[PDB]
Amino acid sequence: MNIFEMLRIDEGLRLKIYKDTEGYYTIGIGHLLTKSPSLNAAKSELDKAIGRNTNGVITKDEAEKLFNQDVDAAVRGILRNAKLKPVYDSLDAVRRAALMNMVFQMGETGVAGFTNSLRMLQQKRWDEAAVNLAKSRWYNQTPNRAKRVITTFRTGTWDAYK
């Protein structure tokens, strides 16, 4: 298992524009197009991202390419963020994948706001962090996915995804 497979599981794969759990227009493997309520705006962002007139539909290859870019961006966002980098540097490989999953879902800024949980992860206080992470809107809104990521930080293994 790895980051790509893990996210592919959590996000799924859709080839036509769709609305995510927050009702925003998305496509592919969790690639957020826009927060605006306009479908046209979404088709516009889509074409600009793919580089052709898509008409709201993309191929598998195109989805994958977006996904690759998004994963890379996530790492790099981690590494440039002063509250995140240090955490990431302290963790082992499986747990780094759990931090990336969260950044991919909620953005760098959203995760950096889990100050207290971050501190706990840095200290390697697994159970405590797991409890603190669950006291969040993130957990109450997408509880199954959040449980998977949380178990991942708690245990340092991929069991939740096997």
Positions 36 through 75 that interact with Cl ion (CB under 5 A): 49
Based on the residue annotation, tell me whether 11 is a catalytic residue of this protein.
yes
CB nearer Cl ion, residue 49 or residue 99: 49
Q: Which stretch binds Cl ion (CB under 5 A): 74-82, 103-111, 130-138, 140-148?
A: 140-148
Which amino acid type is present at position 139?
Answer: Y
Residue 145 binds Cl ion (CB under 5 A): yes
Which residues bind to Cl ion, rule: CB under 5 A? 49, 142, 144-145
Which positions are annotated as active-site residues?
11, 20
Binding site members for substrate? 32, 104, 117, 132
